[PDB]
Write a structure and sequence with these properties.
The PDB classes it as translocase. Keywords: snare, NSF, Sec18, AAA+, translocase. The entry is titled "Y20S (Sec18-Sec17-Sec9-Sso1-Snc1) EDTA - Class 1". The structure is cut from a larger assembly and holds three copies of chain A and one copy of chain B. Chain A is built from 23 helices and ten strands. By secondary structure, chain A is α/β, with parallel strands linked by helices. The longest helix of chain A is centred in the middle third of the chain and has 19 residues, at about 300-320. By secondary structure, chain B is mostly helical. Helix content of chain B is about 35%, strand content about 0%. Chain B is built from one helix and no strands. Chain B starts with about 35 loop residues before the first helix and ends with a helix. The chains are: A alpha/beta, B mainly alpha. Chains in contact: A-B, A-C, B-C, B-D, C-D. Chains C and D meet through helix 5 and helix 12 of C and helix 1 and helix 6 of D. Bound molecules: adenosine-5'-triphosphate (ATP) (4 copies) and adenosine-5'-diphosphate. One adenosine-5'-triphosphate binds near residues 135 and 354 of chain C.
Chain lengths: ~525, ~55, ~550, ~220
């Protein structure tokens, strides 16, 4: 009775606890008499599995506290094998003796015995295999199966298996009556992330060792992609930045300010540096988006504003209605006018749970079949979360259009055309945003029928907008910014450049000769 | 049209491991575990013959 | 006798218990003992190895002064070396930092009581400097390594316990050959006042009989666990160093062997680094040249946490290496006064850290050969000749012709491209070179303009490539490279793609880089009869 | 014997200054002989006092390559058996590979321990040890290039890399290798510290051809 689930350190994984508890131990709560009158057998086999660094070992270690009587036995996979002929087989069928005897004696009163194989995949590889070395690796697994299936009425045993990779294992362990339930344990959510901070940071918090300045919620918000393992790693990095301010390692000797030791305290900036040190293998790194828009949005005209409101209309549209489960749009305009950034602006402002982008850079260097595979991977993955934003960049480049033949790769084009018309599985919605610069080509391949609506983005032409951007760039002083535009008015009033080129010219002229004679010159040659 | 894609077959190698006789058992097997009780006897000869020489 | 050092500053006493059947289990307070020692015994002269009978609450002791510090009045800091010689003596004062350590018998339950003092066997040896290691360059990575790894072992344990933290227990070093990634492991093993390292060469674990390989990898920790269960935290550090890890610990799941041994060793090591049981006093080192084949699981935090990259040195490091290598020679007066090391550092552009040593060897070899003249003119060895040996600058100049870089193999193409010489038969050339220099400067100074591309075009045979080479050579950038048809000839198409991809990828290391591409047209297989040419290479370039 | 105050050369010298290039019997190749003797053996004739004052370790590697049938094995054999050192430990090409799971790499480890122990016992007065790899280019291939479904191409290379220059130092052996194709050997074997001096042996000159006729007849 002296227990509740709150009192132990596993954060986030509450649902999994409920499922496992309901599947494993519920049947053995009641007096035995009910269950035979209920005509239901107990589950004997358990599998826990997940990626490296999820916390499973902590569960396997701690659960022995809750689960009364005495102690689950623990073994490591490779410990079982042995030198002498026949010893290895003996070893496995030596574990079951005690419970067998006790049970055989006492009938159903037997105390429940638990055994846990950590690192199961060591030796239980798929028995129907070849390589034809010494056959010990077969005998072993056969032995377990004999003791596990034809148990001869041994109904007080739960075997628990821990692994990092389910696939390796014999399918002849994955069947009813033997390892029935398989529990997947995946990366924590944001709330679980907060509990992991809570549990890791307990002690240091009580003892007045962290400055009140720190606020856990924002740290949890930032750390979008971390398993618990990394979380304690980050904690120790932050603590270390704290400790290293008194002890100056290397330089000089050990200079300990005995006084400052009492005042030692971690602070927020330490945590930021700690963040700067560690890096997850979570790997998606969708910060890609922000580096795309690193040149930024200055909103130099109304056209951008109108476009942004239209994008807002569509994101609301897909969010609200239930019959619109798929919307696609095309964004076209002159080259270098700057298109990808605008779509990125829409996407980042959207704030959906789910985003990715596809761009030739990540695609670079594979062979064709690998391209095809990658593209498929990304689409299928996108279908999971309820609401999803996905961006396709520079289609023409993905298809390898060159006008000589004209030559290009058909298969990828077909794949994309088919993919864009796929309504997702039930009760998902999707928003697909594609950009291009060579509209006529798209017209002539005649795939223009797969786009619901299209957006033009003309480049800038009026000297006033130039004045806006250049005041934003702080190119020159006020009089300078006036005189240049006055001179440009008569030098070449008709004007058509773009945006990217304008920034490039601005920088070149800024360094070299920020008078008219360079910036205006380059702008004229370009125009 | 066509080219290469998967080929070989007749070509593979294998290493080979090895276990050992069981009787081997623990090192103590004849003239090993008996040396414990054979020593007490030999200490007996030493003594009884210490009586002899004295 | 002493002159100035007349007081006892800090005294470390091995407090054996008098009679060992009387062993009192009650906690012994170092503060009470120090106060009693001063109060009862004041203004006495003590020397190292003086033994004393200390009666504290009827529990006698055999105090032995292991060591004594002698300090003069007026010393704010005790910079005087703690002297183990019996000659040093002092006068006990009310300020003596009295440290008690357990006797030889270890029977006394001494406690630290707010004693903000060095831990009993603080491994890092309180006065210790990077210059004494003997490693030139890489003066930053030592900060990362020592800060992250050993910073937390020095600090007193109770506070660390208050933090509620566990020590790191992994360390990895990787890089290209010859950069000095083995020297560090050795000197760290040797200079840290720990147990002797348990060295293992890479494929030294595996063994014939089934089940003997794994047994070996778990014999290495046996002493550690044996000690830890007994003495707990006051264990001294055990260090075991793996050499050349990727031999055995590949990604499990491949078809490496056909037997299934690699998986087992991986499994055992994985289970034992973290496992169910806590060790908290162990450290493992690694070295390798390829970081990509290690099974991913090893790299999760808790195992091989901090990973450090070792790359080729810059100029300052090169100067430091010459300073370290040619150390004994100078102080033994065997060196001509004419050599100036800065110029040597300047000449050796792409030399690695392992090549300078061969240079020294070759230079000396010339010197010695001048005397012996192996072969024909034998037996000239005599005292006069060997009594005035000195290396000269031209020996090093000669030595440059024997040792050759390994990474600086593509710039040779550039310097030979202008073998024909250069002539300034027209004004135009000067304008062009000046413009190029302007652009080079520009990319050098700026911060936000991180990519600039230029093109050179004109009629065939006009002498284009040489001009680019001259522009490139005068920049002085650390990293220069050239891609030309000569390199790619004979390869297969996929190999070409791979090669170009790799070239761009390793062009992302140095802060400043210059890259030259020769005759794009021929790279893409242009022939006008079709015309025909290879799309894939084109697209790759256009993307890149 | 004992080293007097006067700096006389080593008691148990290796090269014996009553030595001559025409004793070998290899005609033609002449400058290469000069190079090899200059770079490698010079350090071991002078008194240890100076050379230790000179704080340099002797070179511990030699590589010979060239077309087939030029004289490589002749050089190796001659250098083998007109010096003052223990008998070389010859090994033909694929002699190392062995059956059981850990026998090949033990076989590489077998070659060096004698020098190791003797070095521990005495030190700088050790006799030199020589080991000859005939035909290096069979097993020591680039790592990660051959699929090597049979994993012997990597364990062998790693063992030799670790043990020729490892955590523990050893400076009284000399390893010399012969090959026809140096383009496939692993690159880490060709840095200073391992196989320092590399020599090409080419087809003979006309005057060399005269020399060869003189030798043979
Ligand atoms: N109002 C703006 N509209 C568009 N881009 C802007 C604006 N303000 C700043 N920028 C920046 O100008 C740059 C030009 O856009 P970008 O680099 O995407 O070029 P692009 O036209 O998409 O190139 P490409 O023709 O290769 O597709 C981006 O960094 C973008 O963020
Ligand atoms: N600071 C230094 N950097 C590099 N090398 C140094 C340095 N100081 C001395 N050396 C010499 O250069 C050699 C560097 O080689 P090292 O022992 O690190 O092998 P390595 O670089 O690990 O090669 P591999 O990675 O192939 O084993 C050392 O043997 C040492 O004698
Ligand atoms: N401005 C110059 N003044 C004097 N010599 C030059 C000049 N430019 C090039 N050269 C010399 O003329 C030769 C240039 O030949 P190179 O093959 O580089 O010309 P190219 O036109 O780039 O080659 P290709 O004929 O393949 O196009 C080199 O030997 C170089 O030394
Ligand atoms: N330069 C030379 N001087 C004297 N004899 C020579 C010379 N070159 C070759 N020979 C003769 O050629 C014979 C064989 O030489 P060797 O065995 O070295 O050829 P190799 O280079 O080993 O050929 P492979 O590389 O095929 O083994 C020797 O016995 C030797 O008498
Ligand atoms: N709530 C948590 N979630 C995940 N990991 C945690 C949590 N709390 C603590 N940890 C730490 O993370 C590590 C988990 O290691 P684990 O993932 O079990 O390795 P493996 O997956 O190889 O078994 C443990 O050291 C544990 O102390």
């Amino acid at each position: 009775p002296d227990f509740k689930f709150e009192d132990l350190g596993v954060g986030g994984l509450d649902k999994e606890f409920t499922k496992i508890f309901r599947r494993a131990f519920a049947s053995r709560i009641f007096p035995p008499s009910v269950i035979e009158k209920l005509g239901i057998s107990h589950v004997k086999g358990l599998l826990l599995y997940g990626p490296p660094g999820t916390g499973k070992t902590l569960i396997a270690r701690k659960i022995g506290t809750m689960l009364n009587a005495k102690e689950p036995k623990i073994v490591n996979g490779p410990e079982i094998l042995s030198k002498y002929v026949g010893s290895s087989e003996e070893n496995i069928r030596n574990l079951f003796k005690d419970a067998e005897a006790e049970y055989r004696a006492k009938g159903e009163e037997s105390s429940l015995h638990i055994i846990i194989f950590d690192e199961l995949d060591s030796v239980f590889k798929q028995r129907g295999s070849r390589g034809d070395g010494t056959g010990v690796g077969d005998n072993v697994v056969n032995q377990l199966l004999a003791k596990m299936d034809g148990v001869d009425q041994l109904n007080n045993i739960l075997v628990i298996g821990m692994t990092n990779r389910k696939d390796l294992i014999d399918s002849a362990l994955l069947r009813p009556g033997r390892f029935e339930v398989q529990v997947e344990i995946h990366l924590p959510d944001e709330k679980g992330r907060l509990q992991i901070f809570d549990i890791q940071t307990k002690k240091m918090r009580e003892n007045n060792m962290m400055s009140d300045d720190v606020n856990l919620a924002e740290l949890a918000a930032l750390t979008k992609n971390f398993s618990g393992a990394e979380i304690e790693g980050l904690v120790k990095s932050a603590s270390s930045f704290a400790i290293n301010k008194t002890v100056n390692i290397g330089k000089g000797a050990t200079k300990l300010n005995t006084k400052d030791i009492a005042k030692l305290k971690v602070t927020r900036e330490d945590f930021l540096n700690a963040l700067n040190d560690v890096t997850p293998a979570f790997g998606i790194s969708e910060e890609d988006l922000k580096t795309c828009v690193e040149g930024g949005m200055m909103l130099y005209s109304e056209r951008v504003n109108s476009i942004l409101k239209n994008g807002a209309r569509y994101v609301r549209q897909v969010r609200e209605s239930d019959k619109s489960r798929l919307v696609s749009l095309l964004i076209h305009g002159p080259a270098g006018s700057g298109k990808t950034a605008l779509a990125a602006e829409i996407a980042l402002k959207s704030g959906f749970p789910f985003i990715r982008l596809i761009s030739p850079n990540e695609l670079s260097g594979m062979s064709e079949s690998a391209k095809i595979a990658y593209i498929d991977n990304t689409f299928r993955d996108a279908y999971k979360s309820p609401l999803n934003i996905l961006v396709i960049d520079s289609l023409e480049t993905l298809v390898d259009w060159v006008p000589i033949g004209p030559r290009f790769s058909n298969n990828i084009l077909q794949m994309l055309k088919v993919a864009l018309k796929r309504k997702p599985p039930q009760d998902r919605r999707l928003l697909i945003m594609t950009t291009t610069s060579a509209y006529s080509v798209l017209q002539q391949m005649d795939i223009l029928s797969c786009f619901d609506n299209e957006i033009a983005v003309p480049n800038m032409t009026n000297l006033d907008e130039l004045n806006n951007v250049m005041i934003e760039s702080n190119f020159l002083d006020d009089a300078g910014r006036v005189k240049v535009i006055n001179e440009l008015s008569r030098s070449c009033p008709n004007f058509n450049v773009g945006i990217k080129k304008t920034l490039t010219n601005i920088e070149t002229a800024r360094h070299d000769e920020d008078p008219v004679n360079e910036l205006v010159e380059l702008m004229t040659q370009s125009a | 049209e066509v080219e290469a894609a998967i080929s070989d077959v007749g070509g593979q190698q294998i290493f080979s491991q090895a276990l050992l006789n069981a009787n081997r058992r623990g090192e103590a097997k004849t003239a090993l575990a008996e040396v414990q009780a054979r020593h007490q006897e030999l200490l007996k000869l030493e003594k009884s013959m210490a009586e002899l020489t004295q | 006798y002493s002159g100035k050092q007349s007081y006892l500053g800090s005294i470390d006493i091995d407090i054996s218990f008098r009679a060992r059947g009387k062993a009192v289990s009650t906690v012994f307070d170092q503060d009470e003992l120090a106060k009693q020692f001063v109060r009862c015994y004041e203004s006495q002269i003590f020397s190292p190895t003086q033994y004393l009978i200390m009666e504290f609450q009827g529990h006698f002791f055999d105090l032995k002064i292991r060591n004594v510090q002698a300090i003069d009045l007026g010393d704010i800091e005790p910079t005087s070396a703690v002297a183990t010689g019996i000659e040093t003596k002092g006068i006990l004062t009310k300020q003596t930092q009295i440290n008690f350590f357990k006797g030889r018998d270890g029977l006394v339950n001494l406690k630290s009581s707010n004693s903000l003092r060095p831990r009993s066997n603080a491994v890092i040896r309180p006065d210790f400097k990077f210059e004494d290691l003997g490693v030139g360059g890489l003066d930053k990575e030592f900060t990362k390594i020592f800060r992250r790894a050993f910073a937390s072992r020095i600090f007193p344990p109770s506070v660390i316990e208050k933090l509620g933290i566990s020590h790191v227990k992994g360390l990895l070093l990787y890089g290209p050959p010859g950069t000095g990634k083995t020297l560090i492991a050795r000197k760290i093993g040797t200079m840290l006042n720990a147990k002797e390292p348990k060295i293992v060469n890479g494929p030294e674990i595996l063994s014939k009989y089934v089940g003997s390989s794994e047994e070996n990898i778990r014999n290495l920790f046996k002493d550690a666990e044996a000690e830890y269960r007994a003495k707990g935290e006051e264990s001294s550090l055990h260090i075991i160093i793996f050499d050349e890890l990727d031999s055995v610990f590949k990604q499990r799941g491949s078809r490496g062997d056909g037997t299934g041994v690699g998986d087992n060793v991986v499994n055992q090591l994985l289970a034992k680094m973290d496992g169910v049981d806590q060790l908290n006093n162990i450290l493992v080192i690694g070295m390798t040249n390829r970081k990509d084949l290690i099974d991913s699981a090893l790299l999760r935090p808790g195992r091989f946490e901090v990973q450090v990259e070792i790359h080729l040195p810059d100029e300052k490091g090169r100067l430091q290496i010459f300073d370290i290598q040619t150390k004994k020679m100078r102080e033994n007066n065997m060196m001509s006064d004419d050599v100036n090391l800065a110029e040597l550092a300047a000449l050796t552009k792409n030399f690695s850290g392992a090549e300078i040593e061969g240079l020294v060897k070759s230079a000396s070899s010339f010197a010695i050969n001048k005397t012996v003249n192996i072969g024909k003119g034998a037996t000239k060895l005599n005292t006069k000749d060997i009594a005035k040996l000195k290396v000269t600058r031209e020996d090093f100049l000669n030595a440059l012709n024997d040792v050759t870089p390994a990474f600086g193999i593509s710039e040779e193409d550039l310097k030979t491209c202008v073998e024909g010489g250069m002539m300034l038969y027209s004004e135009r050339v000067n304008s062009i070179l000046k413009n190029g220099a302007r652009y080079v400067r520009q990319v050098r100074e700026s911060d936000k303009s991180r990519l600039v591309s230029l093109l050179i075009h004109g009629p065939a045979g006009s002498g284009k490539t040489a001009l680019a080479a001259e522009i490139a050579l005068k920049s002085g950038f650390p990293f220069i490279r050239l891609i030309s048809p000569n390199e790619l000839s004979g390869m297969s198409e996929s190999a070409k793609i791979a090669y170009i991809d790799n070239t761009f990828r390793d062009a992302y290391k140095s802060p400043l880089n210059i890259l030259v591409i020769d005759s794009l047209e021929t790279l893409v297989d242009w022939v006008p009869i079709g015309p025909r040419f290879s799309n894939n290479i084109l697209q790759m370039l256009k993307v890149a």
